[PDB]
Amino acid sequence: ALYEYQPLQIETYGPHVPELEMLGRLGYLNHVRAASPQDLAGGYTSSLACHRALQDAFSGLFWQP
Amino acid sequence: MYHNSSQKRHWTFSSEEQLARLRADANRKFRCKAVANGDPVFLEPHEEMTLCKYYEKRLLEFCSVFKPAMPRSVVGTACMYFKRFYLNNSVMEYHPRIIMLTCAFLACKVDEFNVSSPQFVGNLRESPLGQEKALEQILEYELLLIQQLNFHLIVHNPYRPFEGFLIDLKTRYPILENPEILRKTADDFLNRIALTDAYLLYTPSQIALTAILSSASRAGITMESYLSESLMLKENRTCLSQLLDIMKSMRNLVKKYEPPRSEEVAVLKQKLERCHSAE
Amino acid sequence: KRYEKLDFLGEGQFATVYKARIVAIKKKDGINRTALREIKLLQELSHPNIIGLLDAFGHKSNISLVFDFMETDLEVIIKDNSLVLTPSHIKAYMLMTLQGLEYLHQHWILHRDLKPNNLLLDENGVLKLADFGLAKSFGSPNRAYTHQVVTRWYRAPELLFGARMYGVGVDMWAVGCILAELLLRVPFLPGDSDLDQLTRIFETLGTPTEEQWPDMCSLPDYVTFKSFPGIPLHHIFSAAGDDLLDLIQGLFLFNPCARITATQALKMKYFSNRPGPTPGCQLPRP
């Protein structure tokens, strides 16, 4: 009865959001404000903001009541 | 998140006809109470709608001059609370002047915009006694408002989605060289969209994208490749057609939006005051 | 309204809790901001390891929140000297905590009050994150937060150094402290003040350096501490296998960015390895 990680299956009804760790490589973080040293020291990265904003833009773009 | 939100589930309606039916039911359900208690004193649904449009404008004015600076998120939430409230309630039963302030008051708490009661009612242009009366009325209706919202307090506004699309366009759509030239006109169109029933009929993402593509169309920029190439709707042509029809439908709501006329509002205000004098 | 009002369960600062026919009801500023916080967040969340808000109602400026009735919490389990916490039990508790937290973090909400007594268990041994009175959305740059969140014993060093902005690390550190309390059966880091808390962290885990935590000195309440070596984790957790020490290590990374996320924690070999997590129905009951 061993555990195996399955990702959370949540239908977003919108375009694919790139993974948080890929945002730097894909060039998204060039268009979000840099997290300050104090922000970074607490674990707040510009990648969080950017990822939240893309997810909100794509959430339910295709959904119809 | 919008895609599993109460907003999507319970407060995004199939059509204007379905809204008009909720509002019509509200108007006749009040009339049936007032007649059962005890003439042309009663407002017709189209008159209620004119007053609600007028008070929604007064809610925006309130939130715009509110010190300390109210975040757009709180204003969006308050305006949504106001629209939702008057789907299922008559302006003849609950005065929209009180409900609109109670909307702003609740929105400030829900959106974690920490203001004390006195600094809230400090923003009203009334005597200290008037502000204390206003506060007592807001406290009386705060639970009523929450009940009529069915305790669905999180509102998804189009503003974050709007930010997400601008990041995406700047990253993946270099054909649009500077996407920030769309911001002012796209914001102007978002404001206009907000005056309509759009917030009850479309997703925040759909609203945000409509604003951006409307602003693009006014600029002369034909950016249908963003939908087909970047959003990958060239694969799913029906999903593309469905999306273009939502945006057309939303552009049509804004074109056919009539603002309340001064002389009309004055007459319906006097009529509204007369309804609340007797109850 | 439609609730029998059976038994008294407890009292708090902002509310009082009663058992009702089975559910738990929690009864000039207006309606309590802690009550609104719980209503507004739990209405938007639906996950087996997050407490369900079944109904809300009241009168005047008083509301009653209706929840699933929970039988016990981890604090009762940990403090119960009779019941033995096997490695399988610990894994199960941690798995559900993390699955609830993965879902919560996916929806851009921090709990910010993780501790054994906010990890409620039902009769079926399903663990739920409860008490969303301090829970808050994260990942917004404009939003400013307070550093006094999380009860002191479970508070992460970035909070204790006055982090205004933070992320899932505040929950994951508390998850490490819960794990440590499950393994030791006593609070890991029982500090009597914000300075005694930081001391106990650094005396146990070592004083972090600019290598282990690049920008630690930029945090507004940062105080330079005596450089301790810190007790090797295998000396603290004598019975912990290497997989569990790797989990603990990752939950207690000083750098909150490096500190493992709920999803990363869930993907760690600890959760995959033998023995498997105890099924809910077989978890120990006080």
Q: Which residues of C236-248 are buried (b: 16+ CB within 10 A; e: fewer)?
A: bbeebeebbbbbb
| Neighbouring residues of C66: CB distance < 8 A, sequence distance ≥ 6 | C3, C20, C23, C24, C25, C53, C54, C55, C56, C57
Domain count, chain B: 2
How many residues belong to chain C? 286
DSSP-derived pairing of the beta strands C53-59 and C7-11? unpaired
Contact C241, C272 (CB under 8 A): no
* Chain A interface mutation, best of B171, B177, B240, highest count of A Cβ atoms under 10 Å: B171
Q: Which residues are CB-contacts of C41 (< 8 A; sequence separation ≥ 6)?
A: B154, C109, C132, C135
The residues, any chain, with a CB within 8 Å of residue C52's CB and separated by 6 or more, are C42, C46, C67, C68, C128
Token look-up 């009309």 returns B264
CB distance C68 to C254 below 8 Å: no
Cα-Cα-Cα-Cα dihedral sign, residues B262, B264, B269, B274: positive
CA distance, residue A48 to nearest chain C CA (Å): 5
Query: Is the CB of C108 less than 8 angstroms away from the CB of B1?
Result: yes
B196 and B216 share a domain?
yes
Nearest residue, CB atoms, A53 vs list B14, B160, B246: B160
The residue type found at B233 is: L
**Among B23, B135, B138, which residue's Cα sits nearest to residue B88?**
B23
From B107, B75, B87, select the one nearest B13 (Cα to Cα).
B87
Please name the helix (run of DSSP H) or strand (run of DSSP E) that holds residue B168, with its range, or none: helix B159-172
Instruction: Examine the domain organization and report whether B37 and B90 are in the same domain.
Output: yes
Residue C43, CA distances (Å) to A4, B5, B112, C51 in order? 29, 8, 16, 11
Kindly report the CATH number assigned to the domain that includes residue B215: 1.10.472.10
B22 shares its domain with B96: yes
Provide the token pair at B222: 């034909």
CA–CA separation, B37 and C136 (whole Å): 46
Domains assigned to chain C = 4-68 (3.30.200.20), 72-268 (1.10.510.10)
Determine contact: C44 vs chain B, CB below 8 A. Answer: yes
- For this experimental structure, what is the resolution in angstroms? 1.7
One of C7, C29, C113, C194 is an active-site residue; which one? C113
Q: Which residue, chain included where needed, has tokens 């809910």? A: C280
Long-range contacts of range B271-274, CB-CB < 8 Å, 24 or more positions apart?
A: B271/B41, B271/B43, B271/B47, B272/B43, B272/B51, B272/B91, B272/B92, B272/B95, B274/B41
The CA-CA-CA angle for residues B45, B48, B51, to 5°, reads: 155
Beta-sheet pairing, C109-110 with C119-121 = unpaired
Which residue range(s) make up the domain with B232? 159-257
Among C165, C41, C48, C53, which Cα is nearest to C107's?
A: C41
Token digits of residue B122? 């400090």
> Residues in chain A, how many?
65
Residue A6 in tokens: 């399955």
CB burial of residue B72 (10 Å; 0-12, 13-18, 19+): middle
Phi and psi for B265 in degrees, rounded to 5?
-60, -50
Partner C contacted by A9 (CB < 8 A): no
- Co-location of B172 and B233 in the same domain: yes
Nearest residue in B to C47, CA atom: B4
Cβ contact C108–A52 (<8 Å) = yes
- Tell me the C-alpha distance between C143 and B108, whole Å: 13
Tell me: do B92 and B121 sit in the same domain. Answer: yes
C113 catalytically annotated: yes
Name every chain A residue with its beta carbon within 8 A of the beta carbon of C267: 5
How far are the Cα atoms of B163, B225, C30, C41 from residue B172, in angstroms, in the given order? 14, 11, 47, 33
Name the β-bridge partners of C66: C25, C55
The closest alpha carbon to C251, from C156, C161, C140, belongs to C156
Give the phi and the psi of residue B72 in degrees, each rounded to 5. -50, -35
Six token digits for residue C60 = 């005047």
C-alpha closest to that of B7 among B157, B191, B177: B157
CB contact under 8 A, C57 and B4: no
| Shared-domain flag, residues B197 and B266 | no
Confirm or reject contact between B143 and chain C (CB < 8 A). Answer: yes
Comparing alpha-carbon positions, the chain B residue that sits nearest to C134 is B112
Q: Does B219 touch chain C (CB under 8 A)?
A: no
Report how far residue A55's alpha carbon sits from residue C144's, in angstroms, rounded to the nearest whole number: 21
Closest CA to C35 of C67, C72, C10, C6: C67
Among residues B82, B75, B17, B5, which one has the least CA distance to residue B48? B82
Q: How far, in whole angstroms, is CA C73 from its chain's centroid?
A: 12
Q: How far apart are CA B42 and CA B92, in angstroms?
A: 8
Reported in sequence order, the residue ranges of C21-92 that DSSP labels E, i.e. its strands, are 23-26, 53-59, 62-68, 72-73
DSSP conformation class of C50: B
Q: Are residues B139 and B23 in the same domain?
A: yes
User: C171, C264 in Cβ contact below 8 A?
Assistant: no
Q: Which of residues 36-65 of A touch B (CB under 8 A)?
A: 50, 52-65
Residue B29 half-sphere exposure toward CB, CA atoms < 13 A: 13
Spatial separation of the C-alpha atoms in residues A18 and A10, rounded to whole Å: 15
Neighbours of C84 (CB within 10 A): 9
The backbone torsions φ and ψ at residue C8, rounded to the nearest 5 degrees and listed phi first, read -80, 135
Outline where DSSP puts E strands in A1-65: none
Whether residues B143 and C31 touch (CB distance < 8 A) is answered with yes
Answer whether A60 sits within 8 Å of B231, measured CB to CB: no
Max CA pair span of chain A? 46
The answer, yes or no, to whether the previous bond of B68 is cis (omega within 30 of 0) is: yes
Place of tokens 């268990």: C121
DSSP classification of residue B259: P
First to last CA, chain A: 41
**What whole-number distance in Å separates Cα of residue C5 and Cα of residue C27?**
12
